[PDB]
Structures are given as structure tokens and as C-alpha cells.
Design a protein around this ligand. Structure first.
Ligand SMILES: CC(C)Oc1cc(C#N)ccc1C1=N[C@@H](c2cccc(Cl)c2)[C@@H](c2ccc(Cl)cc2)N1C(=O)N1CCNC(=O)C1
Length: 89
């Protein structure tokens, strides 16, 4: 057993649509399922594989924006700030 926290139903949907290893994880575990989700869903640019385009996806509707970069993680962590509680203080 993991001994960690469950994100809300829409966010858990992204992670399960990716194939997550439970319903209880840390920020660093939950966000790893986004990387595998995009790699399976191939939501990145043809020109820039590290640039992500979630427009029309559940992950995009949940982000509230069609795009972010592997070099700019900020809006993911902000979508977690209010969806997911962590050990961090
Ligand atoms: C899925 C595409 C976009 O990912 C990549 C492609 C490239 C290129 N060119 C370079 C890097 C990745 C990358 N970098 C990480 C990452 C770590 C920390 C922060 C962030 Cl934001 C990203 C993580 C990932 C995790 C969450 C998300 Cl939301 C998206 C992507 N991520 C991967 O999931 N990877 C890299 C390793 N092998 C794989 O098969 C997939």
C-alpha cells in the first residue's frame, strides 16, 4: 500500500486513462502519468516533442488551456494546487 493522497474525479480520470498504479499518489507520481498519457495520446507538436497541445482533450479542459511545455510545468502544478493535497508544507 502507498500511504498517499487521491486527486479529484476529473484528474484521476487522466491518470486512469493513462494506466495509473492505484488511486493514491504524490505530486511527482501523479504528474508522471501525464507524461505517459501524452506519450500514448501523442498530444505534442511534430516540430517540438517537448511542447504539448491538449486542445480538445480532457487533460486540456482540466488544465483550462490547450498548451504548455516540458520546460514550463507551472500550469500543471497549479491545476494540482486546488485538486490534490500533498505532504509538502
Ligand atoms: C510526453 C513527452 C512530452 O515527454 C517528453 C518529451 C521530450 C522531448 N523531446 C522531453 C521530455 C519529456 C518528458 N519530460 C518529463 C517532465 C518532467 C518534469 C516536468 C515536465 Cl512538464 C515534464 C515527462 C513529462 C511529464 C509530465 C508531462 Cl505533463 C509531460 C512530460 N516526459 C516524458 O513523459 N517523457 C520523457 C522520457 N521518455 C518518454 O517516453 C516520455
Amino acid at each position: 500500500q502507498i500511504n498517499q493522497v487521491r486527486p479529484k474525479l476529473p484528474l484521476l480520470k487522466i491518470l486512469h486513462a493513462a494506466g495509473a498504479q492505484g488511486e493514491m499518489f504524490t505530486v511527482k507520481e501523479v504528474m508522471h502519468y501525464l507524461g505517459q498519457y501524452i506519450m500514448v495520446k501523442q498530444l505534442y507538436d511534430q516540430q517540438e516533442q517537448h511542447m504539448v497541445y491538449c486542445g480538445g482533450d480532457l487533460l486540456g479542459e482540466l488544465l483550462g488551456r490547450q498548451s504548455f511545455s516540458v520546460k514550463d510545468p507551472s500550469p500543471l502544478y497549479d491545476m494540482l494546487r486546488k485538486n490534490l493535497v500533498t505532504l509538502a508544507t
